[PDB]
């Protein structure tokens, strides 16, 4: 049986602050610029609709130069860092970005039709844009976050399923890697292997997996390592109502309509889809620039950062403003000409993560050792890397630690609270 | 006279948690896919506008392997499970879906007409869509939920009523079966037997009954078995204003207008109808992912789950995102062509129901036996199935029970509250 980590871990009055100086990432908002024929990316895709997961690294307290280690006995106990407070700072001004597809699959605006739709003549794709769903969610944990998405499974029939038949829906768990895309109102799904048209969805997520944090699974996890604190403030609506083009995969049952004549004799496509909207973004609705205290983590893991690791997932579409960036080819021309200017899109993202840690000690009794081993043997192996598979924003705080909370803003806020 | 169940049922400190692992249902959002000529459904209709009523089954405490039954005397009393806490977990990301009719009956946009409407020339139906009313309602009870809807009654006249005359309005009670459709802003009515056009309403509810929970009847029920706790957070508005086509069933009185001339001489149809809208969906407006404590059920039935049954009705249009699913007939073509891709719509629904139960004991005095018999003799017959008529999501928790609340998230939340 799992036990509240507190039941055996003791807390101390030795507090420390550590936070990045100024994280900054700049890149194209839609797709990763690269070279004409390489997989050498030249400018990364930096969009506000990405899970900026920071794999923070903490110094090992057992090998840390404390001023005097009389507070704990190394001969019988070890040390770990417990996350008491987190502040996800944000510097860039609030503003919702934009994305679109030059050839989004959109037959007609079925929102309000004055006359019946005309014939769907070969490739009626359109240059359409939209402002994506608003999302603000912060996750703090020690195990990597686990999201979700709809992938491809085994089809209903096993007849070497017919070309273009139903792609079966499967619910697939996966670790949310840094740079992955948040659900944008089109549903959490792997468009890459689930939508061939390559036109159902805007460009910036067309060939990426829209993952969503599996809050149920993470909360029901036995040890609750994935997250012990979180928030979510996502919202949107149907800005517009559109229709998909293409041959009907599932024809409307004939008991589900009376046959038409003439122009209406052609049943128009019923494959409707919505266009999301990142509605009001305001300071009052701001998750960030606030200190969250994890003193009462739901999880059995009450903030203990096993392995000197912290996973801080941050989603912020309330600062996803994509700003243009035109550069003049030549100023020798006295009159404006459209082709004289090259168009560039670059989204600026700024992060400044801050933390407060309370030192803890673990007494190595036989029962405590057995429990910790069963929980995660890799923890014992550290005192007495499986994450290479996933890409994270590698953030090192091993030298950023300081014992003077009063000097830093988060430390002062924690002092005033504590 | 009915008596508060507490007046004779005693509570115990023996608590238990039990909840599904991960419920999941996937299917077409509009209509049930089937075979070309059968009533063999191939893919069920899974839409976010459906009453997902779960008929939970609980283990019988009288035949349950408790660690030691010294707490109660089987020779004179029995046991029942009382529902103390419920958490309707939701995993899928929030997002409002969409539905529409290829031939919705819509003459013209009477919202703002620049010129008088033209002639209504045979089958002016249109391909129109809409985003349905937003609804979030959870009902917890022991008897099955009872909704309402407008059906067909006996007409005003009994002359073998003339073809196409008034279909009389009748208010009809009925048990809300799993898969039934919630009111979507078009009113609670049985379109199947009340709208012959088959075009007044979008496809996904065109041939289904729009039921609404009869809160008044359920609350005024003598024993209050149908529900002892509920919530409702539904809202919408008129996105657009439209007009119906067809011959006028009820001609406008002549004292109710001055006759026109020329183009306006033709009185346009006055059969106006609104197009609903599922306005802002947000985390702040979330019923779910929260624990509701039924300690103060209004009902005389204070959560007692007679018959080891629980009926959990869940409506969630704030996660009704319909996601497409294009499949490729053949990649042999280098250029896009509309007919090369088949269109599919599949809506993913994920549920994770959790509960806390407090064990109770019933002392079999003569008066108590008589009262319970009069209330529901079937209860006594269990100690010393009429629901086969209705389809429910049969959810079995008989083996999911556990006495360790601390291990599960709802159990921990209940511990912190209690």
């Amino acid at each position, epitope marked *: 049986a799992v036990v509240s980590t507190d039941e055996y871990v003791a807390r101390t009055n030795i507090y420390y602050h550590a936070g990045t100086s100024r994280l900054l990432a700049v890149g194209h908002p839609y797709f990763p610029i690269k070279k004409p024929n390489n997989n050498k990316i030249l400018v990364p895709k930096v969009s506000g609709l990405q899970y900026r997961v920071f794999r923070i690294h903490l110094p090992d307290p057992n090998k840390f130069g404390f001023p005097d280690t009389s507070f704990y006995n190394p001969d019988t106990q070890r040390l770990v860092w417990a996350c008491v407070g987190v502040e996800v700072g944000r510097g860039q001004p609030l503003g919702v970005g934009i994305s679109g597809h030059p050839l989004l699959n959109k037959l007609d605006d079925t929102e309000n039709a004055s006359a019946y739709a005309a014939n*769907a003549g070969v490739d009626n794709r359109e240059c359409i844009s939209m402002d994506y769903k608003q999302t603000q969610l912060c996750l703090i944990g020690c195990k990597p976050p686990i999201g979700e998405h709809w992938g491809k499974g085994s089809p*209903c*029939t096993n*007849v070497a399923v017919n070309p273009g038949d*139903c792609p079966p829906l499967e619910l697939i768990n996966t670790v949310i890697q840094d740079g992955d895309m948040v659900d944008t109102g089109f549903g959490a799904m792997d468009f890459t292997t689930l939508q061939a048209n390559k036109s159902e969805v805007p460009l910036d997520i067309c060939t990426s997996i829209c993952k969503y944090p599996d809050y149920i699974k993470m909360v029901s996890e036995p040890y609750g390592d994935s997250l012990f604190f979180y928030l979510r403030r996502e919202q949107m609506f149907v800005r517009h109502l559109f229709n998909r083009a293409g041959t009907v995969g599932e024809n409307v049952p004939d008991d589900l309509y009376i046959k*038409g004549s003439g122009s209406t004799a052609n049943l128009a496509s019923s494959n409707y889809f919505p266009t999301p909207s990142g509605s009001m973004v305001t300071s009052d609705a701001q998750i960030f620039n606030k200190p969250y205290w994890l003193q009462r983590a739901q999880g059995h893991n009450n903030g203990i950062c096993w392995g000197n690791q912290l996973f801080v997932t941050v989603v912020d579409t309330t600062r996803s403003t994509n700003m243009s960036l035109c550069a003049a080819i030549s100023t020798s021309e006295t009159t404006y000409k459209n082709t004289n200017f090259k168009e560039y899109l670059r989204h600026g993202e700024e992060y400044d993560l801050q933390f407060i840690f309370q030192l803890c000690k673990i007494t190595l009794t036989a029962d405590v050792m057995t429990y910790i081993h069963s929980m995660n043997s890799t923890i014992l192996e550290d005192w007495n890397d499986p994450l290479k598979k996933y890409t994270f924003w590698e953030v090192n705080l091993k030298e950023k630690f300081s014992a003077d909370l009063d000097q830093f803003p988060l430390g002062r806020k924690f002092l005033l609270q504590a | 006279a009915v008596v508060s169940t507490d007046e004779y049922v005693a509570r115990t400190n023996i608590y238990y948690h039990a909840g599904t692992s991960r419920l999941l249902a996937v299917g077409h959002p509009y209509f049930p896919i089937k*075979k070309p000529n059968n009533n063999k459904i191939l893919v069920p209709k899974v839409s976010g506008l459906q009453y997902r009523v779960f008929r939970i089954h609980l283990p019988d405490p009288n035949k349950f392997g408790f660690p030691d039954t010294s707490f109660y005397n089987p020779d004179t009393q029995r046991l029942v499970w009382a529902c103390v806490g419920v958490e309707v977990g939701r995993g899928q990301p929030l997002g409002v879906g969409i539905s529409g009719h290829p031939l919705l009956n819509k003459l013209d946009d009477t919202e703002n007409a620049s010129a008088y409407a033209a002639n209504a020339g045979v089958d002016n139906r249109e391909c129109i869509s809409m985003d349905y009313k937003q609804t979030q309602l959870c009902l917890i009870g022991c008897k099955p939920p009872i909704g309402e809807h407008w059906g067909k009654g006996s007409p005003c006249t009994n002359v073998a009523v003339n073809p196409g005359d008034c279909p009389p309005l009748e208010l009809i009670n009925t048990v809300i079966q799993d898969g039934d459709m919630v009111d979507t802003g078009f009113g609670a009515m049985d379109f199947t037997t009340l709208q012959a056009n088959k075009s007044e309403v979008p496809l996904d509810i065109c041939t289904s009954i729009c039921k609404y929970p009869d809160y008044i009847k359920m609350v005024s029920e003598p024993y209050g078995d149908s529900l002892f706790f509920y919530l409702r957070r539904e809202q919408m508005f008129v996105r657009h204003l439209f007009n119906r086509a067809g011959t006028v069933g009820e001609n406008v009185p002549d004292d109710l207008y001055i006759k026109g001339s020329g183009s306006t001489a033709n009185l346009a149809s006055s059969n106006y109808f609104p197009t609903p809208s599922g306005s802002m969906v947000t985390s702040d407006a979330q019923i779910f992912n929260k624990p509701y404590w039924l300690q103060r059920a209004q009902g005389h039935n204070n959560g007692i789950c007679w018959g080891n049954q629980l009926f959990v009705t869940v409506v969630d249009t704030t996660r009704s995102t319909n996601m497409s699913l294009c499949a490729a007939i053949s990649t*042999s073509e280098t250029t896009y062509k509309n*007919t090369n891709f*088949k269109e599919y719509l599949r809506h993913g629904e994920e549920y994770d129901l959790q509960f806390i139960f407090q064990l109770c004991k019933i002392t079999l005095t003569a008066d108590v036996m008589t009262y319970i018999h009069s209330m529901n003799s079937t209860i006594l017959e269990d100690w010393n199935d009429p629901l086969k008529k209705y389809t429910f999501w049969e959810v079995n928790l008989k083996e999911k029970f556990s006495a360790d609340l601390d291990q599960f998230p709802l159990g921990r939340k209940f511990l912190l509250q209690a």
Partner: antibody, heavy 122, light 111 residues
Framework: QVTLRESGPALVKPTQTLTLTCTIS??????????VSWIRQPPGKALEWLAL???????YYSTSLRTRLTISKDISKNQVVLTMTNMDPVDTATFFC???????????????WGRGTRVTVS | SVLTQPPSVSGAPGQRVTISCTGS?????????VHWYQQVPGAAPKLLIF???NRPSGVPDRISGSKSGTSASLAISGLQAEDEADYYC???????????FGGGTKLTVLG
């Protein structure tokens, strides 16, 4: 490859019973999603679908000839049996058993066709 | 037949000829796929088009089709001697409850 070879009486007389029989190879009738149809073509006339059978034993027939038609399949022989009752002289036509793939849309199709066998009623 | 086709069309080598199959709201209007079959007389039919303007395996890349209104088309560009065959459109019908074929256009390659 999927191969179909028809067999039956090339000559029949009126008011008799006709039993065609199409053999399938390279494919199993037990596999889910497999279907096979029969399509007859009178001399110099357009094709006319007759019946469809699938893995789920679900059967379809042309409405005009529904009262005369019954189809089945034998897993042991990997076989499809078609029976037409009360043969008329005008039924003379070539009969093709074609592997129907049963796509999601009710516009099914016949991916592969057999050699075809002439049936003459006189 | 519920579906309709021109009884005969002709085209000299190197020309493009379209065989149009027109249905009704019951079969092609509902959205049921249109399939074209090339049949050399006296032999078994062959699958030529699998969905509107879709090419099966082993079919020459010059053959195609289209979907337009309640009708479909079979465009054979760059005609050749091999195109001396009949063609049948095929779909599903809602009044018949069964699968139907067209009138069997008899394409001929002119001298």
């Amino acid at each position: 490859q999927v191969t179909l070879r028809e067999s039956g009486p090339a000559l029949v007389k009126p008011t008799q019973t006709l039993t065609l029989t199409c053999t399938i190879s390279g494919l199993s009738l037990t596999t889910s999603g497999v279907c096979v149809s029969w399509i007859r073509q009178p001399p110099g006339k357009a094709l006319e679908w007759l019946a469809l059978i699938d893995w789920d034993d679900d059967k379809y027939y042309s409405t005009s000839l529904r009262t005369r038609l019954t189809i089945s399949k034998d897993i042991s022989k990997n076989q499809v049996v078609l029976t037409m009752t009360n043969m008329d002289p005008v039924d003379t036509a070539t009969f093709f058993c074609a592997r129907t793939r049963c796509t999601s849309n009710w516009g099914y199709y016949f991916d592969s066709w057999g050699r075809g066998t002439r049936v003459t009623v006189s | 037949s519920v579906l309709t086709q021109p009884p005969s069309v002709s085209g000299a080598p190197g020309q493009r000829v379209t065989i149009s199959c027109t249905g009704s709201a019951s079969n092609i209007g509902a959205g049921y796929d249109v399939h074209w079959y090339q049949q050399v007389p006296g032999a078994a039919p062959k699958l030529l088009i699998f969905v509107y303007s879709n090419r099966p395996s082993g079919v020459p890349d010059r053959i195609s089709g289209s979907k337009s209104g309640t009708s479909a088309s079979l465009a054979i560009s760059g005609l050749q001697a091999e195109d001396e065959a009949d063609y049948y459109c095929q779909s599903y019908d809602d009044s018949l409850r069964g699968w139907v074929f067209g009138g069997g256009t008899k394409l001929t390659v002119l001298g």
